[PDB]
Design a binder for this molecule. Structure first.
Ligand SMILES: NC(=O)c1ccc[n+]([C@@H]2O[C@H](COP(=O)([O-])OP(=O)(O)OC[C@H]3O[C@@H](n4cnc5c(NCc6ccccc6)ncnc54)[C@H](O)[C@@H]3O)[C@@H](O)[C@H]2O)c1
Ligand SMILES: NC(=O)c1ccc[n+]([C@@H]2O[C@H](COP(=O)([O-])OP(=O)(O)OC[C@H]3O[C@@H](n4cnc5c(NCc6ccccc6)ncnc54)[C@H](O)[C@@H]3O)[C@@H](O)[C@H]2O)c1
Ligand SMILES: NC(=O)c1ccc[n+]([C@@H]2O[C@H](COP(=O)([O-])OP(=O)(O)OC[C@H]3O[C@@H](n4cnc5c(NCc6ccccc6)ncnc54)[C@H](O)[C@@H]3O)[C@@H](O)[C@H]2O)c1
Ligand SMILES: NC(=O)c1ccc[n+]([C@@H]2O[C@H](COP(=O)([O-])OP(=O)(O)OC[C@H]3O[C@@H](n4cnc5c(NCc6ccccc6)ncnc54)[C@H](O)[C@@H]3O)[C@@H](O)[C@H]2O)c1
Lengths: 358, 358, 358, 358
C-alpha cells in the first residue's frame, strides 16, 4: 500500500519533506510521491534545486529530469531513485489542482498561501482525501504535534489536519513532559531566537503586516511573533492562556533555540526537571525529544531531526541556584529539518488510521 | 519653477533618490515631489521606511504622515519638511497612473518591472512628459551616465531615458578618463564583487531566470551577470565588443567594488594611470569620480555619493612591476547612495535642457 | 581643571570612550587625555583606526599623527583637535606604566586583562590615583552603574571602580525602577540576544574556558554566559540570588537586547509597568533609561547612547493578556556606544566627588 | 610500514588534515599520527573541536579522550578509531619539541608561525626527518603543488618543503594546463574573492602589517593580498614576473573563487580552453582539477576535495564573444578542505620517494 502524496509548494519545507521521504527509505515503496507543484514545470530547475542545498548539502538520492513525451519543450518529470514524480503547474485556487485525477490521496500543503482550513479544503474539492498543512491552521483545522497528541486524530472527523509550526513542535514536547511528570507550568513566557526564513528580506523592504519583519534580515536582530504562542495551548489545552511568547530573528539561515521561562505548580528543582527530560528522551518521547550534554552551538543541529533537543548544560548552569519554582529551559531545533520529518511521520500515521477504520 | 516629479516604486532606490533630493536642498524649491507610488497608500508606513534605514540610518529631513481629507481612513499624505507628497496606489500598468492629473511631468521609474522603453512609455500616456528608468533599458531608451555623455541628451528625442545601473556608473567614469587621456583599452574584462540586492533571496528559492541568484544570498558567493556589460558600450560605443564582465554577489548589504583588468593601447605605466585618474578626479570628473589614499574597507564607502572612487593603494600594490600594457584598476561605490544621487542630477539636467529649448 | 586621564587598551571600548570624550566636547577643556596605551605606538595606525569605524562611522573630531621628536622613527603622538595625547607602549603589568610621570590620575582600564581589583591596583602604585575597569571586577572592586548607585562612591574608600558590563548597564536601570516603583521582583531569569565581540572567533578556534565561544561567531547562535548575572546583585543588593541569566551570541557586530522574565511582588499589569518605565524614562532616569514606541530592529540603536532603551511595543504585544504576576520586559542597547558613554560619565562623576572631599 | 607524523598547530588546517587522514582510510595502517600539538594538552577539548565543526560537520571517525596514566589530571590522549594520538604541549621554538623521542619522522607544521625555512628546521633539530609547511615559505624552502611539480622533490636535499597556499593550489593547476597545452600566458592578473580566515577579526581591531585586515570580518569586503602572488612563479617558473594578483576577503566562512584574467601566447578561443580544462580534469590532472557544468554557488563546494574545480558556465558566459587572446577563467575551491587533503597527498608522496632512495 503506497500512500499516494502530492506536494503543493516545493520550497524549503516541500523539498525537505521530499528529502525526508527519500532519506527515510519510503520513496516509491511505502509512500508514492505522485506529483510536486510550484511556479515552474521545468523539472531540470527542480533537479538543480534538489541536488544542491546551501544548508543541508547534496542529498543521497539521485535525480533526473526527463520529459514525459518529446512533444514537450522542457523536462517535466522528475526521476528520483528510479521513481517518477510529476511536475504539476501552480494553481491559484487549490480546487483547480487535478489531485483526484493523478490519484493523489494525501496532499501536503506547503505554499504558505492556504493556511485556512477553508481554502485548504479546495484540495479535497480537487480530489484529495486528506490535507496536511505544514503550518498553523486557521478556520477550524486539526493541529497535531507528533509525540504529544497525534492520537486525537480521527479519520472520520479530521480531513484538514495541520502540523503546527517549527517552534510549536519544539516547545510542546518540553511542555508535555513537564505536565505528564507533574512539575506543571503555572505560567510561562517563551522566546525563540530564530533563524531567518523565506518570508524575510535581504535588504529593508515592504512588509505591511509586520513592520519590523521587512528589515534587512541578515544584519539586524528583529523582534516579531511566533506561531507557538497559540498552537501549544491548542495541542495541550491545560496551557491555554498560561503560556505565550515572542521571537527574535537573528542572522543565521537555519536552526533556532527555544528559551522557556516558566513557574512550576509544585515545588521542585532544575535537577529533577533535567532528570525527567533526559528520561523522557530515552523512553516515551524518544525520536521527538532529544538532549545534549555537549557545549554545542547552532551549526551542530543542522540536519538533526529530533523535534526538540534539550540543552542539558545551558539549562543546568543558567538557573537560580536553590530554586523550587522559577525555571529556564533551553532547547534547540533545526526548524527546516525535524519539522519536515514530522510532516512525513504525520502523513504515514494518518494513512495508517485511515486504513485502520476507513 | 519646481520640477514636478513622481517616483514610481518607492523601494531602496526610490527612497534613496527621495532622500538625496532633501539632503541636497531641492524639496519644494527646486524639486517638487508631487507623488510617490508603491504597494500601499498608508503613509504612516512610508514614514517608518523613511525614518529607519538599516544601512544609511536616520535621515536629516522631518517626516510626518497626515490624511489628505478627513474622509480617508489611513494617513495618505507625506509631509517632508512641511512639503506634501502624495501616496498613490500602485498600478499594474504605467498608463493607468494619474500623472497628468496630479500635474507630474518627470517620472522616476524605479519599480524594476518596466525596464522596456515601451512599458516605460505608459507613463507618458498616463500624463508624464519624461521618464528616467533607474536601471538599464531594453526597447531602445537613451542611456546616459552623468559625467560621461549627459551632453548627448536631446529634449526633442529622448523621452524615455535610462541612468544605466550602479556598476555602469562606477566603471564608465574609469573607462572614460582612460579613453580621453589616450591610454585606451584594446580589450578588457571586468568583475564586480557586489552587495546583494532585494532581488536575491534569504534562503534558497526560486529564480528561474538566473538559477544561482535564487540561492541563499547572505551565506554564499553567487556568480552572476552585471548590467555594466551591455551598458558601458551604449555609453561609450568605443568599448562595444572590447569590454564585458561578471558579478560575484557576496554577503554584504551595500557597497560594491569594480575590479577592471585591461590591456592598454599604448605602452604606459600604472603610475601614469594613477596620476591621470587622480587628475581627472580633481578636474573634469569632480563629484563623479573620486579617489582615496587610505586603507579602506566597504563600510567606509557607506554614504559616499561618488559614482566611482578609485583606490589608489589597492591598484598600485596589486599590479605587475614594470608593465606597459596589462593593468588592474580597483574602484569602490555605494551602489544605493551614489546611483540615487546621479538620478537626481539627471532629472535636474534633463529638466534644465528641456527649458532651455522645449 | 582638566581631569587627567589615560586609557589603557585602546580597542572597541577604548576608542568609543575616546570618541565619547571628544564628541561631548570635553577633550582639552574638562578632560585631558594624556595618553593612550596599546600594542603599538605608531600614532599613524592609531589614527587609521579612529577615523574609520565599520559600525559607528567617521568620528566628528580630527586625528593627526605627529612625531614627538624627529629622532623617533614613526609618529608617536596623536593630535586630536590641536590637543596632544601620547602613545605609550603597552606593559604586561599595570605597575610598569608611567602614570605618575605622565601626570595621569584616572585610568580607564579597558584592555580586558586586568579585571581583578589587584592587578588593577598595579596602575595606582605606578602613579594613578584612580582606576575605572570597563568590565565586572573581582577581588572586591566597587561596581557602579551610573544612574542607579553612583551615590555610593566614596573618594576615600573606593579607588578601583568597576563600571560593570554592557548588559548590567542595560538590565540594572529596569530592575532599579521595578523596585523603586514597588512592583518588585520575586525571582527572575534573563537572556540577552547579544552581538559578537572582540573575544570571539571568525572560524572555529581556541577558547578553553568557554567551549562554545570559540565557534565561528558570525554563522552560529552560540549560547553562553553573561556578565549581568553577577553584576546586578553587586549593584542592587535586593536582587542577590533572585535574578540570573544567559547570553546568546548571534551574527551581528553591534547592538544587543535584554529580555527579562520576572514574577512581580504584588499584583500588577504590563500597562502599569509600561507607564512606570516610560515615566521614569522622562523623569529620574532621563539619559540612562529610554523608550521607544516604534517598530525598530537592532540597527536603529547604533549610536544610541542610552544605557537601556525599552521597547514598549514588543513588550505589550508579547506578554500574557490579563496577567498579574508573570511578565517579560524587552529592552535594547548599543553595547559599544552606550557603555563607553557611561565610562566617561563615571570619570566625570567620581572626579568631582574627589575634588569635593579629597 | 606506517609513516610517523606529528601535527604542530591543530587549528583549522591541522584538524582538517587530521580528518583527511582518517577519511582517506590511512589512519593506523598507512599513516600513524603519533602526536598533535596546540595550546592545550586537553584531549577532551580536542575531541570537542574534532567532533563538532561549524562548516564541515561531524566527522565519520569516532573520538575518545583518555588519560595516558592514572596520574595525569586531564585526559591527554586521543583515541581515534582505536588509534592513540598524544597531546603534546605547545612550544615556542620547533626545536624544543620531542619529535625524536616520540618517534616522529614527518612533521606537518600548521601553526602559521614557523613559515621561515630556518625556523622550520627546528623540527628536524627536535628529531624529525622532514617538515611540510602548510603555507608558502621563506628562506628557500622548496615549494610544491601536488599535480604540478611534486616530481621535483629530491629526498636528498629537500627537507623542509612548502605546500604553497590555498589560492596557489587552485591557480597553479589552471596555469599548468594552459602552458602545457600551449595556449600560454603572456601576462596574467588574478583576483580571489575569498572567505575570511582565522587571522581576521570579528570586530575592528589590531592588524599592523595589513591595516585593512583588522577591520570587522563578517561585515566588509576587505582588499588584501594573496599568497599565490609569489608561489605560482615558484612552482611554475615560466610564469615569474608574468602573473600577479590580489584578494578580496568577503563574509563567507569557507570556499573561495579564483577569477583569472590572462592573455594567451597564441590565438585561441574560450571554447578551446574550456575543452582542454575538461580534458585535463579527466586525464592527467584527475582528482586535483575538476570542473562543473552546473549553476553552483560557494556552498556547493564545501567538502569538495578537488584543488581547483573549474566553473564551465561562469567562464563561458562571461568572456568576449570574438576573443582570441584576452580571457577570464573562473575556478572554485574549498580553501580548508582541498588544501588539507593535498598536504596528506604530498606527505605520502614524499615518504614513498624517501623510502625508495633514502
Ligand atoms: N523554513 C522553516 O524553518 C519552516 C519550518 C516549519 C514550517 N514552515 C512553514 O511551511 C510553509 C512553507 O515555508 P518554507 O520555509 O518552505 O518557504 P518557501 O518560500 O521556501 O516555500 C514556499 C514554496 O511555495 C511555492 N508557492 C508559492 N505559491 C504557490 C502556489 N500557489 C499560489 C500561486 C499560484 C500561481 C501564482 C502565484 C501564486 N502553489 C504551489 N506552490 C506555491 C513557492 O514558490 C515556494 O517554493 C510556511 O507556512 C512556513 O510557515 C517553514
Ligand atoms: N539597490 C541598488 O544597489 C540599486 C542600484 C542601482 C539601480 N538599482 C535599480 O533600481 C530598481 C529598483 O531597485 P531597488 O534596489 O530599489 O529595489 P526595491 O525592491 O527596494 O525597490 C522596488 C520598489 O518597487 C515597488 N514596486 C513593485 N511593483 C511596483 C509597481 N507596479 C507593479 C505592481 C502593481 C500592483 C501589484 C503588483 C505589481 N509600481 C510601483 N512600485 C512597485 C516595490 O514595492 C519596491 O518598493 C531596479 O531596476 C534596480 O536594478 C538598484
Ligand atoms: N565591545 C563591547 O560591546 C563592550 C561593552 C562593554 C564592556 N566591554 C569590555 O571592555 C573590555 C575591552 O573590550 P573591547 O570590546 O574594547 O575589546 P578590544 O579587543 O577591541 O579592546 C581591547 C584592547 O586592549 C588591547 N590590549 C591588549 N593587551 C593590552 C595591554 N597589556 C597586556 C599586554 C602587553 C604586551 C603584550 C601582550 C599583552 N595593555 C594595553 N592594551 C592592551 C588590545 O590590543 C585592544 O585594543 C572588556 O573587558 C570588555 O568586557 C566591551
Ligand atoms: N584555513 C584555510 O583556508 C587555509 C588554507 C590553506 C592554508 N592555510 C594555512 O595553514 C596555517 C594555519 O591556518 P589555519 O586556518 O589552520 O589557522 P588556525 O588559527 O585555525 O590554526 C593555527 C593553529 O596553530 C595553533 N598554534 C599557535 N601557536 C602554536 C604553536 N607554537 C607557538 C606558541 C607556543 C606557546 C605559546 C604561544 C605560541 N605550536 C603549535 N600550535 C600553535 C593555534 O592554536 C591553532 O590551533 C596558516 O599558515 C594558513 O596560511 C589555511
Amino acid at each position: 500500500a503506497p500512500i499516494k502524496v502530492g506536494i503543493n509548494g516545493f520550497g524549503r519545507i516541500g523539498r525537505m519533506v521530499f528529502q525526508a521521504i527519500c532519506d527515510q527509505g519510503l520513496i516509491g515503496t511505502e509512500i508514492d510521491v505522485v506529483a510536486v507543484v510550484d511556479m515552474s514545470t521545468n523539472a531540470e530547475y527542480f533537479a538543480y534545486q534538489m541536488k544542491h542545498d546551501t544548508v543541508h548539502g547534496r542529498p543521497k538520492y539521485t535525480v533526473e529530469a526527463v520529459k514525459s513525451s518529446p512533444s514537450v519543450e522542457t523536462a517535466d518529470v522528475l526521476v528520483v531513485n528510479g521513481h517518477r514524480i510529476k511536475c504539476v503547474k501552480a494553481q491559484r485556487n487549490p480546487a483547480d489542482l487535478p489531485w483526484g485525477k493523478l490519484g493523489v490521496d494525501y496532499v501536503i500543503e506547503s505554499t504558505g498561501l492556504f493556511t485556512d482550513k477553508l481554502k485548504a479544503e479546495g484540495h479535497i474539492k480537487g480530489g484529495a482525501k486528506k490535507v496536511v498543512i505544514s503550518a498553523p491552521a486557521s478556520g477550524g483545522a486539526k493541529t497535531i504535534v507528533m509525540g504529544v497528541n497525534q492520537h486525537e486524530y480521527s479519520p472520520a472527523s479530521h480531513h484538514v489536519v495541520s502540523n503546527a509550526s517549527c517552534t510549536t513542535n519544539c516547545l510542546a514536547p518540553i511542555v508535555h513532559v513537564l505536565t505528564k511528570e507533574n512539575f506543571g507550568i503555572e505560567t510561562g513566557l517563551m522566546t525563540t531566537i530564530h533563524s531567518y526564513t523565506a518570508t524575510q528580506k535581504t535588504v529593508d523592504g515592504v512588509s505591511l503586516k509586520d513592520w519590523r519583519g521587512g528589515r534587512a534580515a541578515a544584519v539586524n536582530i528583529i523582534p516579531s511573533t511566533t506561531g507557538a504562542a497559540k498552537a501549544v495551548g491548542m495541542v495541550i489545552p491545560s496551557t491555554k492562556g498560561k503560556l505565550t511568547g515572542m521571537s527574535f530573528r537573528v542572522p543565521t539561515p537555519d536552526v533556532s533555540v527555544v528559551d522557556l521561562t516558566f513557574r512550576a505548580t509544585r515545588d521542585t528543582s532544575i535537577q529533577e526537571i533535567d532528570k525527567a527530560i533526559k528520561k523522557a528522551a530515552q523512553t516515551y518521547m524518544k525520536g521527538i525529544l532529544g538532549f545534549t550534554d555537549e557545549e554545542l552551538v547552532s551549526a551542530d543541529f543542522i540536519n538533526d531531526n529530533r523535534s526538540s533537543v534539550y540543552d542539558s548544560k545551558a539549562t543546568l548552569q543558567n538557573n537560580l541556584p536553590g530554586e523550587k519554582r522559577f525555571f529556564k529551559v533551553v532547547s534547540w531545533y533545526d526548524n527546516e529539518w525535524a519539522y519536515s520529518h514530522r510532516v512525513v511521520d504525520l502523513v504515514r500515521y494518518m494513512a495508517a488510521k485511515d486504513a485502520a477504520s476507513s
